[PDB]
C-alpha cells in the first residue's frame, strides 16, 4: 500500500535534514561533548573561600 516514491523522497530528505540539523545543533551550537564530558578528565581544587 502507498509507496508512491514521491512520499519516499520527502521522507528521506526530511530524515537527512533532521540528522544534519541535530548534529549541527549538538556539535557547533550546544557543545554536547563538552556538556557531557567527552574527551575530558576531572580535576579538583580546594579553596580557602569560594570567591564567588
Amino acid at each position: 500500500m502507498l509507496l508512491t516514491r514521491f512520499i519516499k523522497m520527502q521522507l528521506v530528505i526530511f530524515l537527512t535534514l533532521t540528522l544534519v540539523a541535530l548534529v549541527v545543533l549538538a556539535l557547533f551550537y550546544l557543545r554536547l561533548p563538552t556538556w557531557a564530558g567527552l574527551g575530558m578528565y576531572k580535576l579538583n581544587a580546594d579553596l580557602p573561600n569560594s570567591g564567588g
Binding site: 502507498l2 512520499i7 520527502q10 526530511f14 533532521t18 541535530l22 551550537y29 550546544l30 557543545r31
Partner: protein, 263 residues
C-alpha cells in the same frame, strides 16, 4: 452547556490518546504519509518549502529582531558585549518556543483542521465508519503521532536558525567580533534550558494538534464552516501555546533562575 462542552473535548482527547497504540501497530503507512505531508507541506504551500520554510523564515525574523534591538539598546547604554549572552537568554526562554509554536500552529494545525473539515463535509468520516473503521483512531491519533514525530526536527531547525540569525545580525550587520559573541553565548547558555525547552515544545505541539484535530473533526456548515473552524482553532492555539510556555517557565525557574554572573 459549558461543562458539557468541556466534557465533549475531554472525551475527544481521551479517545484520541487511548487509540495511539492501535494506530502505531495498524496504521504505520498512514503515519508515514502524514509525517511526509507535515514535513513537506501540502497544496500551494508545498512548493515554497512547506512548514519547514515558514518556520525558518519566522524564526530568522525573531532572532533578527532580538539581535537588532539588543545591540541597539546595549550600544546606547555602552555595555554592548553582553548582547551574545542576552540573545541566548532571549531565544531559549521566551521567544523561540513561543514563535515556533505559533508558526507550527498556523501551518500544520490549520492544514489539519482544513483536511479534517473537508473530510467531514465530503462524508469521508461516514465512509470510514461504514467500513467499520475507527474514524478517530484513523485520523486524529495518526495526526497526533505524526506531529509528535515531526515536532523535534522542526524545533531543532527553528532553534538552529534563530541562533544563526542572531549571530549573523550581531557579528556582520553591526560588525561585532565573532569571538566575543561566541564566548559569551557558549558561556552563558545552559543545555539544560534547551532540553527543558524541547520538552515544553513537545507538550505544546501535542496540545496544538489535539485542539486543531478537534476543531476539524466536528466541522459543520459546508465549505463555509471550515474557515470559521480554522479561525477558532488558531485563536485557541495561540492562547494554549502562550499559557503552556508561561506555566513551564514559571515551574522550571521559579526558585533557581539557573543563571549566575556576580559573586
Amino acid at each position: 452547556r459549558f461543562l458539557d462542552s468541556m466534557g465533549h473535548v475531554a472525551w475527544f482527547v481521551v479517545q484520541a490518546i487511548v487509540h495511539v497504540p492501535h494506530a502505531f501497530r495498524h496504521y504505520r503507512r498512514e503515519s508515514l504519509r502524514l509525517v511526509a505531508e507535515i514535513g513537506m507541506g501540502t497544496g500551494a504551500m508545498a512548493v515554497i518549502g512547506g512548514t519547514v520554510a515558514i518556520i525558518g523564515f519566522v524564526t530568522l525574523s525573531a532572532g533578527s529582531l532580538i539581535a537588532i534591538q539588543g545591540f541597539a539598546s546595549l550600544g546606547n547604554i555602552g555595555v554592548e558585549a553582553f548582547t551574545g549572552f542576552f540573545a541566548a537568554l532571549a531565544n531559549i526562554r521566551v521567544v523561540a518556543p513561543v514563535v515556533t509554536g505559533q508558526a507550527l500552529a498556523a501551518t500544520v494545525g490549520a492544514g489539519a483542521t482544513a483536511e479534517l473539515g473537508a473530510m467531514r463535509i465530503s462524508e469521508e468520516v461516514d465512509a470510514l465508519e461504514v467500513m467499520g473503521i475507527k474514524s478517530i483512531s484513523y485520523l486524529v491519533s495518526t495526526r497526533i503521532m505524526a506531529g509528535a514525530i515531526v515536532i523535534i526536527p522542526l524545533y531543532a531547525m527553528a532553534i538552529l536558525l534563530s541562533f544563526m540569525s542572531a549571530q549573523l545580525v550581531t557579528t556582520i550587520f553591526y560588525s561585532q567580533s565573532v569571538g566575543t559573541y561566541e564566548h559569551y553565548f557558549h558561556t552563558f547558555l545552559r543545555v539544560d534550558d534547551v532540553m527543558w525547552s524541547f520538552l515544553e515544545v513537545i507538550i505544546m505541539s501535542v496540545i496544538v494538534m489535539l485542539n486543531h484535530c478537534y476543531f476539524g473533526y466536528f466541522a459543520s456548515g459546508g465549505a463555509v464552516g471550515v474557515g470559521e473552524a480554522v479561525g477558532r482553532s488558531m485563536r485557541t492555539s495561540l492562547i494554549a501555546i502562550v499559557l503552556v510556555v508561561l506555566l513551564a517557565s514559571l515551574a522550571l525557574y521559579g526558585t533557581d533562575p539557573n543563571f549566575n554572573l556576580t559573586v
